Design an enzyme around this catalytic site. Structure first.
Site, PDB file in Angstrom:
ATOM      1  N   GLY A  84      -2.111   6.349   6.257  1.00 42.66           N
ATOM      2  CA  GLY A  84      -3.201   6.286   7.235  1.00 42.66           C
ATOM      3  C   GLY A  84      -3.696   4.867   7.437  1.00 42.66           C
ATOM      4  CD  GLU A 115      -5.960   0.413  -6.431  1.00 39.13           C
ATOM      5  OE1 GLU A 115      -6.863   1.097  -5.917  1.00 39.13           O
ATOM      6  OE2 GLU A 115      -4.754   0.771  -6.462  1.00 39.13           O
ATOM      7  CG  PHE A 160      -6.893   8.332   5.474  1.00 34.43           C
ATOM      8  CD1 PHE A 160      -7.437   7.978   4.253  1.00 34.43           C
ATOM      9  CD2 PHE A 160      -6.775   7.359   6.452  1.00 34.43           C
ATOM     10  CE1 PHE A 160      -7.845   6.683   4.005  1.00 34.43           C
ATOM     11  CE2 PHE A 160      -7.179   6.068   6.212  1.00 34.43           C
ATOM     12  CZ  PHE A 160      -7.724   5.727   4.989  1.00 34.43           C
ATOM     13  N   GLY A 161      -8.801  11.101   4.349  1.00 33.55           N
ATOM     14  CA  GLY A 161      -9.934  10.998   3.432  1.00 33.55           C
ATOM     15  C   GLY A 161     -11.209  11.593   4.005  1.00 33.55           C
ATOM     16  CE1 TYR A 162     -14.968  11.765   0.098  1.00 35.09           C
ATOM     17  CE2 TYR A 162     -14.232   9.514   0.015  1.00 35.09           C
ATOM     18  CZ  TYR A 162     -14.589  10.667  -0.617  1.00 35.09           C
ATOM     19  OH  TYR A 162     -14.523  10.762  -1.975  1.00 35.09           O
ATOM     20  CG  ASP A 164     -10.184  -0.900  -2.938  1.00 41.16           C
ATOM     21  OD1 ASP A 164      -9.880   0.262  -2.589  1.00 41.16           O
ATOM     22  OD2 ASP A 164     -10.690  -1.190  -4.030  1.00 41.16           O
ATOM     23  CB  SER A 165     -11.654   1.036   2.429  1.00 38.16           C
ATOM     24  OG  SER A 165     -10.769   2.146   2.295  1.00 38.16           O
ATOM     25  CB  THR A 178      -0.869   0.070   1.257  1.00 43.53           C
ATOM     26  OG1 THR A 178      -1.637   1.275   1.242  1.00 43.53           O
ATOM     27  CG2 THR A 178       0.020   0.055   2.527  1.00 43.53           C
TER      28      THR A 178
END
Lengths: 184, 184
Positions: free
Chosen positions: A11, A36, A140-142, A65-66, A7
């Site tokens: 995070g 991906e 991180f992210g949303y 993956d998420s 990866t």
């Protein structure tokens, strides 16, 4: 036991290493880019990924993956959560969600694990809602716009241990750890 | 141990009694009508229901709500799965889903359990897709048009034990049984 986690998300690195850490599992972050696929499901992307990192990476290996799946947006951004985050950002989701009667969403994480000529999948899901404004400085992210069910704080208002107790990734890691003690 | 399950759904009755049966739990089907609120979430309906059957029914008691949530239809019919089934039926969903690029859906079950001045919730979720035509003679409701992930058969092509191994209700019942052995 050592696990090589392919990866480039730091995070994710931390969440995974720390959780599996306290049971004496050393997680090793390799950066080998893999493909991906576009797909309706996270598990489809994970399957393809493991199949491709066949014999290019030291074993045992894991990948993840998420995505955030927003009910009133028919599952968007879903599998493409990482892309949508970097292009339209937190402000984009909030703009899309203005005036929404339904702010429900879920996070899903799928872990793929390869060991002994074989791949295994584990998954975790946390339900929640999109906040009306961004809050919080962690994660991180949303994370700053997602409040999981039962909580008043966004994912980003919590610590790693606190998110891991409630998050999608934490649950997949739990399911994974339960399988590990039964098979190693 | 005996549990009083307030419901008028005989398909639910059987699934629950049989599963908890083989661990020596006798499930008793009381018919006491209670109010199901409109709500965005199954758990909201369950909470309200338990709170209302307070001291009108013998204890310990359990209730359940469940629904089919169709991704491309923004979660419909969801919480109102029972109503939508009896009005528009299996043909209605299939008509709505004609030409759909996305046929993904999930079933969710939420069990509420009351014992000792206290309520507890357990839930289960199975992901899948809506079939292109109805198949199978078992089960109830949308069973003939739902194929869970990993399977080729619809819920209605399987037996109770087979559905319980894969279904949303089976998973909530498992989570429930895990809590029961730890608390009684």
């Amino acid at each position: 036991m050592k696990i090589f986690f392919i990866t480039s998300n730091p995070g994710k690195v931390r969440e995974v290493a720390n959780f599996l850490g306290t049971f004496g599992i050393e997680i090793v972050q390799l950066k080998h880019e893999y493909p991906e696929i576009q797909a309706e499901k996270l598990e489809d992307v994970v399957d393809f990924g493991i199949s491709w990192l066949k014999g290019k990476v030291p074993e045992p290996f894991m990948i993840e993956d998420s995505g955030l799946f927003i009910e009133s947006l028919k599952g968007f951004p879903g599998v493409y959560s990482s892309y949508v985050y970097r292009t339209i950002g937190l402000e984009g989701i909030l703009k899309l969600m203005e005036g929404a009667e339904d702010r429900r969403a879920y996070f899903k994480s799928v872990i793929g694990f390869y060991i002994d000529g074989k791949a295994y999948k584990f998954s975790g899901v946390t339900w929640g809602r999109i906040s009306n404004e961004k809050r919080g400085t962690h994660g991180f992210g949303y994370d700053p716009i997602f409040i999981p069910e039962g909580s008043e704080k966004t994912f980003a208002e919590m610590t790693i241990e606190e998110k891991n107790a409630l998050s999608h990734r934490g649950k997949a890691l739990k399911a994974f750890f339960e399988w590990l003690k039964v098979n190693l």
